[PDB]
Design a binder for this molecule. Sequence first.
Ligand SMILES: C=C(C)CCOP(=O)(O)OP(=O)(O)O
Ligand SMILES: C=C(C)CCOP(=O)(O)OP(=O)(O)O
Ligand SMILES: C=C(C)CCOP(=O)(O)OP(=O)(O)O
Ligand SMILES: C=C(C)CCOP(=O)(O)OP(=O)(O)O
Ligand SMILES: [Mg+2]
Ligand SMILES: [Mg+2]
Ligand SMILES: [Mg+2]
Ligand SMILES: [Mg+2]
Ligand SMILES: [Mg+2]
Ligand SMILES: [Mg+2]
Lengths: 288, 290
Amino acid sequence: DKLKKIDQTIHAFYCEKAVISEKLNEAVLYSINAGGKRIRPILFLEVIEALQIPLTESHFKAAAALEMIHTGSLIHDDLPAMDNDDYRRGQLTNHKKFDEATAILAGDSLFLDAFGMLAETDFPTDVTVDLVRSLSSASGTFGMVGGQMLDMAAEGKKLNLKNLQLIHRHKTGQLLAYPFWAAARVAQLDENLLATFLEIGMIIGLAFQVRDDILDITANFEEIGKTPKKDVMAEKMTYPHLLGLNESYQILDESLDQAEAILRKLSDEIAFAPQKILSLIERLRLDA
Amino acid sequence: SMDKLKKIDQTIHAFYCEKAVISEKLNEAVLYSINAGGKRIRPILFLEVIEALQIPLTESHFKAAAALEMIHTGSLIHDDLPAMDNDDYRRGQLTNHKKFDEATAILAGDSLFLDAFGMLAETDFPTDVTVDLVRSLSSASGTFGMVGGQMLDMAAEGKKLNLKNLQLIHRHKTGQLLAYPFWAAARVAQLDENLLATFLEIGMIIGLAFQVRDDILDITANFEEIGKTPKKDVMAEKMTYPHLLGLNESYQILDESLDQAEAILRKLSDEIAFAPQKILSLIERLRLDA
Ligand SMILES: C=C(C)CCOP(=O)(O)OP(=O)(O)O
Ligand SMILES: C=C(C)CCOP(=O)(O)OP(=O)(O)O
Ligand SMILES: C=C(C)CCOP(=O)(O)OP(=O)(O)O
Ligand SMILES: C=C(C)CCOP(=O)(O)OP(=O)(O)O
Ligand SMILES: [Mg+2]
Ligand SMILES: [Mg+2]
Ligand SMILES: [Mg+2]
Ligand SMILES: [Mg+2]
Ligand SMILES: [Mg+2]
Ligand SMILES: [Mg+2]
């Protein structure tokens, strides 16, 4: 239902204006339709719902904007000059399906279009401006793209945990923290609560990358939908490479536990029903 | 008042230096392309329209101008890439990917796109104004604007198409981000719908004209003049104005387009509190002779 509606919202954005380049629209939609867990938009919508706010088309637009930036980031991450994968979401990567130019531009479209999507909501305009500012912050030079540069620069280097945390909190952490913070902001919560939601999001965001690192070296192709073990060949700074699998599994499980405990704590202090968020977090757990 | 070019660049610099650095290499790559050069026509036109409308310039106007220049800059970085136009030179210097590497250039362009909206949301404009500016800048830049035009441009390589299809490419890849500063300044000025449409119209005329001009320069001017490799359009079999219509008719179209834009601007000056002399002088600097 949420899943279906998120994809409807994205399809609507691309199919309700007069088309300029049919090939561009097709390339953008290819990557969207290839698959994806939709964790980021789902979390935004679940927090709104948990905070007792009926979901509207505007919430789905805000959620879609977040997913659009996430999708653009994947398309560029996969490119030959970056991680160079032939597969994403169980299908050919955008650049192998089409060509590199098309993939570069499809990613660019998603980044630029995302802010138009976000600006189409019926939220109060002060809310919208804050969401735009924060989404830029999470995504750009001081967020995801900054993290991506650090990830590429760390290849083959012996970095420490602080530096590994810096990569992971930025390349992945920021865009998983944003949906928690953004939902709280739309709910117009006070500063203390906005900080607690950002904290939960930052814990989930770092844990998600620890999880992604573990899966890179433990899972098969069918399970992850991308070529396994690229992190090893590329000499990426990762949790397993720095700390080992045993510690990485412990950190993932502890982090997920902590996020859940903070969520349950909130429900003692405000009108907040986190059961769906808790269910989603449970589905992220791994077994060695 | 202040030199606009220097203030625009200082505004962009401050955006990158006012927050704790995450990747120094990224900041360096972004600023390299900004600092390489550029006429800054897009942000200058926005600022000139604000001033022509008798509005004193503020930090916020420079931020909005800077955001536009950031998107424009990101578009050049990606346009130069090996998978796209494959130029080794831009703004008289090595292109971003030849100075650094392909990955760096991809990410530098991505940064500029994503950062631009953060820049725009830093203004002190009324929030309803900012939301409209964000929506419109996305429209001008994305799948229905610049990027859409970029895809059409690559798809038309080696293809014979008509004027209609050539205009579709040009209006979207270049027209929209030259139309935006006119529309956006009128929007910040809070002009009525009719005036917003008139300013957009002026900008679309100037925007289409600027690409005709660019097409003409790519085949008539040398490397020293344009700061990029001449004649790339020819070798890659791009659809251009001189190819579709000949050089003579292309010069004629440029001149008459710039005439048309100037006429609308003069008419507005006879109707509202608007003083476009500096805009008109900028437009005159865009003229070419055979
Ligand atoms: C680890 C990161 C940040 C990239 C993959 O994210 P996901 O694992 O959420 O990818 P999809 O489900 O969207 O394919
Ligand atoms: C912005 C991104 C893609 C962060 C996750 O990095 P990875 O390169 O490990 O993600 P996957 O390709 O493994 O999904
Ligand atoms: C839209 C086009 C023709 C790309 C180059 O734009 P400019 O000719 O304005 O480039 P800079 O001055 O910014 O270098
Ligand atoms: C979005 C852009 C960059 C439009 C100009 O494309 P061109 O490829 O014609 O411009 P130059 O490289 O000649 O500046
Ligand atoms: Mg990567
Ligand atoms: Mg990757
Ligand atoms: Mg990975
Ligand atoms: Mg080009
Ligand atoms: Mg080019
Ligand atoms: Mg050109």
